Amino acid sequence: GAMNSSNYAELFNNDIKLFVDDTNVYRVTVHKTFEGNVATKAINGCIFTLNPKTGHLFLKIIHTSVWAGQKRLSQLAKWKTAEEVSALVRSLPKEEQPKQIIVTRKAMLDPLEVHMLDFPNIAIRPTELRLPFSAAMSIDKLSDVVMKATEPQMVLFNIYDDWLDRISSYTAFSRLTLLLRALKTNEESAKMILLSDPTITIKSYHLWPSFTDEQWITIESQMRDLILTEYGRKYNV
């Protein structure tokens, strides 16, 4: 059924699985019109489809042209997400296809379940975890490829860089979710933490800086402090 804290190690077993987050598929800026009404302008979005064991991220860029002349865009975006995840599964060799797809928002269940009616052995599951994948667009290289796209495009990344050479998937996912939670709670301060020291750089082929094991411990502590700091600023604690 649903994925929660009780069954958390299941994410790192040898059954292929993907998380799907649709929170950045349909993105808009709201503005006033000349007549003083309100209108939206869409900007490019993306589907965040992640294998939590390997770090492989299938970033499908959703170009604003897909919304042209369409109605009820927030509803359509869920079906377009399911359409594209469906298409991704069909493009993978059988031995690479997931056995489970976990959606981060329960509104994706029926659209995805409908799109995968002819794939009955792939479980479509919700989660009780509050995962910070919306903050993917705070990763500079991901935001850059989305905003520069002029047509639909799929871009492949490893969201863990080379971390799995030194740490387990469980620890890598924990680091990722901590980084993304910090970027979601206070993006300016998180980015300051990650780049404050000009001597630690981001390799051309990486998303995050090239921290040593000890530096990662310092960074992780600073991110926890940020999250707690913001939690106190928010609730006046």
């Binding site: 359509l76 079906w79 399911a82 359409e83 029926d110 659209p111 409908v114 009616l117 002819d118």
Partner: protein
Amino acid sequence: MNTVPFTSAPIEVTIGIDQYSFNVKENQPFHGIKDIPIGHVHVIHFQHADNSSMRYGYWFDCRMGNFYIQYDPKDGLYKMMEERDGAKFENIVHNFKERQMMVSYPKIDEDDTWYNLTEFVQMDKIRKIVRKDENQFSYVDSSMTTVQENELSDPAHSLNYTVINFKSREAIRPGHEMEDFLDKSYYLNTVMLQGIFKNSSNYFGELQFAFLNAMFFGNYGSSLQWHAMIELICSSATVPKHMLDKLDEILYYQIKTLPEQYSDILLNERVWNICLYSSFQKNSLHNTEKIMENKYPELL
């Protein structure tokens, strides 16, 4: 006007005939039901006094044969049988009528309730839902499961209603996933009406039969089928106008006849609130919406 005689009544039982119910005491001199209107299917049903477990009964049409009831002390129930000897049958009925041992189908002349509940129900279609080809009448009980219930366990004792499943390959056309799920018109009009049922009369007949089995036997799978067949129409943006108007009449009489005290178990809140207030047909069921709001405002 036709007659279903009873050999005897050896166990105390509540007997119902369509929407009417009466009690018979253990070994009471009771020999059946007369003045049954010709032209409709009927149902004769039973609930034993000492074990209300298992309501059961028989759908029949007196135009198809001479039928009677006899208690079987081995299987412990009142069974319907056919008498092939017409002169024996007529002589039995005449004797029981002369001795005034038969209750009379108490049909008020003004009252169209049974016609309105069975307008599209035909014995031939009942016999394909309930498969027992050697009899002209059909047995149903509280516990019988449907073909769909069994997919999710004796197949010979099953209710073969048409399977409706909104998240299936039958429901959804390749490349029309959003369209077909949010607007079920394809599934209603092409798959079900044109393809399976052939016409709306057969669809309404199965819907009406499902409701009556839900109401008279507490048959849960029949209640599921009735609501699924309602939801499939209400969730379609394109439905022939004559079908919507007829559905409103069908459901009005069903809601009118439903015992008020069974509403909690026989009516699905989600389906009814969706059908009346959110669906494409939310404004097409005026009579049904009015009776539902006046009779069952809590459910809504």
